[PDB]
Amino acid sequence: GSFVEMVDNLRGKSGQGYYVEMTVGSPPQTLNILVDTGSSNFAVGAAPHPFLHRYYQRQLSSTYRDLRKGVYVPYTQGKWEGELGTDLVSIPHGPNVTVRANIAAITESDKFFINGSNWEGILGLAYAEIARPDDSLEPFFDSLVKQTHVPNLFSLQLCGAGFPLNQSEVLASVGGSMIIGGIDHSLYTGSLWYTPIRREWYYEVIIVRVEINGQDLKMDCKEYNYDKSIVDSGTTNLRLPKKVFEAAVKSIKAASSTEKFPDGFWLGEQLVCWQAGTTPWNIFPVISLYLMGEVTNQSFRITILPQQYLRPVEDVATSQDDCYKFAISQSSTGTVMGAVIMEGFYVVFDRARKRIGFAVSACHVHDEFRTAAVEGPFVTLDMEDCGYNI
Ligand SMILES: CN1C(=N)N[C@](c2ccccc2)(c2cccc(NC(=O)c3ccco3)c2)C1=O
Secondary structure, eight states, X not given: XXXXXXXXXXXXXXXXXXXXXXXXXXXXXXXXXXXXXXXXXXXXXXXXXXXXXXXXXXXXXXXXXXXXXXXXXXXXXXXXXXXXEEEEEEOTTXXXXXXXXXEEEEEEEESOSOTTOOOOEEEEOSOGGGOSSOTTSOOHHHHHHHHSOOOSOEEEEEOOOXXXXXXXXXXXXXXXXXXXXXXXXXXXXXXXXXXXXXXXXXBEEOEEEEEETTEEOOOOGGGGGSSOEXXXXXXXXXXXXXXXXXXXXXXXXXXXXXXXXXXXXXXXXXXXXXXXXXXXXXXXXXXXXEEEOSSTTXXXXXXXXXXXXXXXXXXXXXXSSEEEEEOEEEESSOEEEOHHHXXXXXXXXXXXXXXXXXXXXXXXXXXXXXXXXXXXXXXXXXXXXXSOOO
C-alpha cells in the first residue's frame, strides 16, 4: 500500500548511479550505497581512495567479524578486491531492522569508485549464484529475509530529472525510492504487469518482440535474449546484443531521419545539443519491448520515450543548450535493461513469486504528446523459444 518511511530514500542519476543510505558496524558508520540489481555482493570501500571522502573502518566496529578470506573481482570496466567479513547493517530510510550481513571490505580498486557519484559501496541485490567468490556468500537481501519478517520482495522507482543536475543539485534532489518488503501505490500509475524471472541468478527475463514506433524489428526473438536479458540498475544504458543493436539503430536513424546526427552520437560517445527548450522529441521514435506474461501465450509491452533513451548531460561550454547522449549501446553479454529504461517505470522485484512487475512511473519524464506505457495483454506464441540455451 503506502511505505512513507522508504519513499524518496534514493539519490543520484543514470550516469553515476542511484544510491541509498546504509549504516555498517557498531557504533553505526553511515555510507551511501549504489543500488545494483545486476550483482550479488554487499561491497564497501574500507580503505582510503582519492574519490572517497569516507569508508568502512572495521577496527572501529565492535561487531565486526573477520571471515579470513579475500575476494578478487576483476570486471570489464575495472576491478575491486577486498576482505570478507560480517557486521551489523541497517537501512536508516528502510525497514526498522538490523541484520548481520556479509561485507566485502574493499582494500584496492581500479575505476570502481566514480569521482562525484557520492557512493562508497554497492548493494548487490541479485541472487547467490553470481555472488563472489562463490554462491556460499549469502547476499544481503537473503540475510535480511532470513533474519526478519520483511517480505521477500523489493521495488525500485528511479527518477531521472530530465535535465542535468550539477554537483549541489544532485546532492539536494530526491532521486527516487527503494521500497524494501513492499509495493507503494503512489509511485506508479495504471496497472502492474508481471513477467517471470526465468532463472534466479541475475534478474533474467524474456523479451518476445521489439517495435520502434510500432514497426516490428522482425528478428528471431532468440536474438533479443542472446545470451540473456536482465534488469540492471547497476548499468546506465539500455544495452542490446550486437545484431539487435545494429537493427534497432538502423530503425531509430530511419524514424529520426529529418535530422542527421554524427556517427559518434549513435556510438554513445558524443553529445548532441539543441537551443534551450527546442529538443525535437517528436522526431525520435518510442521503443516497445514485449515481455513474456505470466499467462500461457500472453505477453505485455513496456514503451519508452526518447526522454528515457536520450540521457541529459551538461554541455562542454556550460551553455544554455539542452544536450544529451544516446543511452542505447551494444553488448556481447545479452540485453541489459539499465537505469535509463528503469527511469520510465516502477519496477517490482517479486522474489517470492519469481516475477518482475512493471508499471508507468509516477516520476517518468515525458512531453504533452506522449507518455511511457505498460500495456497488455497480447497473444504471443512459442515464447519459451525466445529464451537462449548454451
Ligand atoms: C554491470 N555491472 C553491475 N550491474 N554491477 C557492476 C559489478 C558489480 C560487482 C562486481 C562486478 C561488477 C558495477 C561495478 C561498479 C559500478 C557499477 N555501476 C555504476 O557505476 C553505475 C552507474 C549507473 C548505474 O550504475 C556497477 C557491473 O560491472
